[PDB]
């Protein structure tokens, strides 16, 4: 009862009433009420500053609303912006949903997994199944433009440049956010003539290929540096590749690049000679910290020769590969500060004090009758499920799997498959570790309420105490908690949104841990809030 007519908003065929264009400052985390990019900010923190939900009341969390999502692998994220959730579904379905009520607003359906869409200005951006960079009108969901390049993690947009990697089975492109025009494209495999071609064991260029889903891009505004990682070469066996002895320059390399041009500023290969599908493409965070690595910390591999001990530095830090080794670099220069193993791993025999990795020759397939007991696995260790950062305690919080595989089983001495480590970013010391019988295989979200949210393959959605790792709240969803957790605020109410239902990884871990009720189904966004 406004006018005498019934004003309506037909779900799926409506427009956002008030859409404000998304800025660089939004994407840098400038509005705690929103979660406008995969990890909450450009810098990859996976953090919300919202603290209405905290250690004291999280035990009271209830289900506010949920909504069914497309069937298939459900690894996506509830991107939230001024009361609207922008939700990438499987099968290139993109929805705008009222973040308070769960009413569908609009739905774009293109003619599997989508980990995120991206926001910038007045448009919603994603990379489709048929390798188009696509822009939708944010307000209405109508197609604005699409450019055929020739993904699963989703782009980010930096100052009007849509940056998007590629699934390799291999490049990263920058595309104008308003016109659709491709601006640049970076490739990784050196051609004979370029530096590094001699690291490919004599394999002819036309027979080299890379393989791996492309990972999460992060960004530092002040340095104006985009960070991504490249994957390994395929197939995984260097004998089958014809690259025996080859360290494979270009592969499994962390790049820092200029967003307007793709120009490479610094790079560092975090895993040469990959024989283990290590995919060093996962998110690396930009954080400021005192630089004080403890050479005697558990798992520490080496400390950089001239590390700026005691100084404050903006660093690029985190675990880039399935191997589970955390790295820390100077964000601006790429100077190597330190590296630290987490899970049991035996593909890296050592890392010297300049960050040069030496792989374990004994884990390279040579004799077919020999036993090759590799740790971790093609699922990690870590995998694409993202870490989170707790700026209040300077902790890097990463979900892991305690697994090993014959080159899928629990690692030696581990009864719990699922694991979350919290690592001091200043010292590299592990401050706490949460473990549980089922594999997690799901991102975390860190919060200013001193909480860590994480889901599991046997459907448990948990909040951990960020100071101790102890579980303080849990619920259980219809299927494996397979997607991302985000948080946003509307009318003073903090919402915690998680995407669940199952993924490719759900079944591999249903097999290794036979005692847990890991099952797929009920794809959906599920949103929690206090009473
Ligand atoms: Ca526009
Ligand atoms: Ca993969
Ligand atoms: Ca064996």
Pairing assessment for the beta strands 300-303 and 336-340 based on DSSP bridges: antiparallel
Provide CB contacts within 8 A for 17, sequence distance 6+.
none
- Residue 331: both structure tokens together: 């964000």
259 CB-contact burial (10 Å; exposed 0-12 / middle 13-18 / buried 19+): buried
Please state the separation of Cα 139 from the chain's center in Å: 27
CA 119 – CA 124 distance, rounded (Å): 5
> How remote is the CA of residue 277 from the centroid of ligand 2, in Å?
8
State the resolution, in angstroms: 2.0
Task: Note whether 411 and 404 are within 8 A (CB).
Answer: yes
Q: Is the peptide bond before 51 cis (omega within 30 degrees of 0)?
A: no
Cβ atoms < 10 Å from Cβ of 202: 11
Tell me, in angstroms, the distance from the centre of ligand 1 to residue 7's CA. 28
SS3 373: strand
**302 Cβ contact partners less than 8 Å away, ≥ 6 residues apart:** 338, 339, 350, 351, 352, 353, 355
Give me 333's structure tokens.
Answer: 């220069």
Cβ proximity of 29 and 42 under 8 Å: yes
Element (H, E) at 462: strand 460-465
Helix (H) and strand (E) counts for the chain? 3, 41
Residue 165 falls inside a structural domain: yes
Nearest ligand for residue 135 CA: 1
The Cα-based distances of 433 to 56, 292, 418, 421, 502 in angstroms read 21, 21, 10, 4, 25
Give domain status of residue 5, yes or no: no
Question: Per the domain annotation, does 3 fall within a domain?
Answer: no
Please name which of 141, 159, 173, 153 lies closest in space to residue 26, comparing C-alpha atoms.
Answer: 159
- Which stretches does DSSP call E strand in 274-402? 285-290, 300-303, 312-318, 326-330, 336-340, 348-351, 357-359, 373-374, 388-390, 395-401
Q: Are residues 50 and 32 in contact, defined by beta-carbon separation less than 8 angstroms?
A: yes
Dist. CA 80–CA 82, nearest whole Å: 7
* Alpha-helix runs per DSSP H in 168-321: 238-241
Rounded distance, CA 156 to CA 266, Å? 20
C-alpha 235 – ligand 3 centre gap (Å): 21
In contact, 45 and 285? CB cutoff 8 Å? yes
Other beta carbons within 10 angstroms of residue 104's beta carbon come to 18
Tell me the H-state helices in 320-421.
none
Q: How far is the CA of 181 from the centre of ligand 1 (A)?
A: 13
CA distance 94 to 142: 11
Tell me the C-alpha distance between 355 and 496, whole Å: 38
Residues with CB under 5 A from ligand 1 (ion): 122
Query: Which domain range does residue 357 map to?
Result: 24-529
A 10 A CB-CB count for 198 gives 12
Distance 503 CA to ligand 2 centre (A): 12
- The structure tokens 């040579």 sit at 366
Q: Which of 390, 398, 495 is nearest to 442 (CA)?
A: 398
- How far apart (Å, rounded) are the C-alpha atoms in residues 170 and 506? 27
State the DSSP code for 212: B
Q: Which ligand is nearest to the CA of 374?
A: 3
Ligand 2 centroid, distance to 449 Cα (angstroms)? 32
Residue in 96, 119, 98, 106 with CA at minimum distance from that of residue 22: 119
Given a contact cutoff of 8 angstroms between Cβ atoms, the answer to whether 475 and 417 are in contact is no
Cβ(13)–Cβ(252) under 8 Å? no
- Residues with C-beta atoms within 5 A of ion ligand 3: 371, 373, 406
Instruction: Specify if 477 maps to a domain.
Output: yes
For residues 488 and 486, give the distance between their C-alpha atoms in angstroms, rounded to a whole number. 7
Given its phi and psi angles, is residue 334 left (phi above 0), alpha (psi -120 to 50 degrees) or beta? Answer: left
CA of 383 to the centre of ligand 2 (A): 7
For residue 461, give every residue at least 6 positions away whose Cβ sits within 8 Å of its Cβ, in sequence order, or none: 453, 454, 455, 474, 475, 476, 477, 481, 498, 500, 526
Among the bound ligands, the one closest to the CA of 119: 1
Question: What's the token pair of residue 278?
Answer: 């290590």
Length of the chain: 531
CATH number of the domain residue 233 falls in: 2.140.10.10
Q: Cα separation of 441 and 445, whole Å? A: 13
Query: Which ligand ends up closest to the CA of 408?
Result: 3
Total domain count for the chain? 1
Cα 179 to ligand 1 centroid, rounded to whole Å: 9
DSSP at 506:
H
Cα of 512 vs centre of ligand 3, distance in Å, is 15
Sign of the torsion angle spanned by Cα atoms 245, 248, 252, 257: positive
Q: What whole-number distance in Å separates Cα of residue 23 and Cα of residue 28?
A: 9
Query: β-strands 485-490, 471-476: how paired?
Result: unpaired
Question: Which ligand is nearest to the Cα of residue 278, counting in written order?
Answer: 2
Q: How far is the CA of 371 from the centre of ligand 3 (A)?
A: 5
User: Measured in Å, how far apart are the chain's first and last C-alpha atoms?
Assistant: 28
């Amino acid at each position: 009862a406004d006018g005498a007519a019934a004003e309506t908003a037909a779900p799926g065929q409506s427009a956002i009433e008030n859409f404000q264009p998304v800025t660089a400052e939004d994407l840098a985390g400038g509005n705690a009420a929103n979660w406008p990019i995969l990890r909450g900010n450009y810098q990859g923190w996976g953090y919300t500053q919202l603290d209405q939900i905290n250690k004291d009341n999280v035990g009271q969390l209830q289900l506010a609303w949920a909504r069914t999502m497309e069937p298939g692998s459900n690894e996506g994220s509830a991107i939230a912006y001024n009361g609207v959730v922008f939700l990438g579904n499987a099968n290139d379905v993109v929805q705008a949903i009222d973040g308070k009520t769960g009413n569908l607003i609009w739905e774009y359906r293109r003619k599997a997994a989508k980990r995120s869409i991206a926001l910038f200005g007045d448009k919603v951006y994603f990379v489709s199944w048929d390798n188009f960079v696509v822009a939708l009108d944010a307000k209405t969901g109508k197609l604005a433009w699409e450019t055929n390049r020739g993904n699963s993690s989703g782009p980010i947009v930096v100052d009007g440049v849509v940056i998007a990697g590629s699934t390799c089975q291999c490049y990263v492109t920058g595309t104008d956010a308003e016109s659709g025009e491709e601006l640049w494209r970076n490739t990784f495999i050196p051609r004979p003539g370029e530096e590094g071609d001699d690291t490919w064991g004599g394999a002819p260029y036309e027979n080299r290929w890379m393989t791996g889903a492309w990972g999460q891009i992060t960004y530092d505004p002040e340095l104006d540096l985009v960070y991504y990682g490249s994957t390994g070469a395929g197939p995984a066996s260097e004998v089958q590749r014809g690259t025996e002895g080859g360290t494979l320059a270009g592969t499994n390399t962390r790049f820092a690049v200029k967003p307007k041009t793709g120009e490479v500023v610094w790079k560092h290969q975090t895993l040469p000679r990959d024989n283990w599908d290590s995919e060093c493409t996962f998110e690396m965070m930009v954080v400021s910290t005192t630089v004080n690595p403890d050479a005697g910390a558990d798992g520490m591999m080496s400390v950089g020769a001239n590390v700026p001990r005691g100084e404050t530095r903006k660093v690029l830090t985190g675990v880039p590969c399935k191997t589970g080794v955390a790295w820390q670099f100077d964000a601006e220069t790429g100077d190597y500060f330190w590296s630290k193993a987490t899970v049991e791993q035996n593909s890296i025999a050592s890392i010297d004090d300049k960050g040069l990795v030496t792989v374990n020759e004994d884990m390279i397939l040579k004799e077919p009758g020999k036993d090759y007991n590799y740790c971790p696995t093609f699922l990690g260790g870590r995998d694409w499920p993202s870490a989170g950062y707790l700026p209040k305690s300077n902790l890097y919080v990463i979900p892991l799997s305690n697994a090993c595989y014959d080159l899928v089983k629990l690692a030696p001495g581990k009864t719990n498959m699922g694991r979350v480590d919290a690592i001091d970013v200043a010292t590299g010391a592990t401050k706490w570790s949460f473990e549980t019988e089922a594999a997690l295989y799901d991102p975390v979200m860190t919060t200013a309420g001193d909480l860590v949210f994480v889901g599991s393959t046997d459907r448990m959605f948990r909040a951990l105490d960020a100071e101790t790792g102890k579980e303080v709240w849990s619920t259980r969803l219809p299927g494996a908690i397979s997607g991302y957790t985000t948080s946003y605020s509307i009318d003073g109410r903090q919402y915690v949104a998680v995407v669940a239902g199952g993924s490719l990884g759900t079944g591999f871990f249903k097999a290794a841990v036979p005692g847990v009720d890991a099952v797929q189904g009920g794809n959906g966004i599920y949103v929690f809030a206090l009473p």
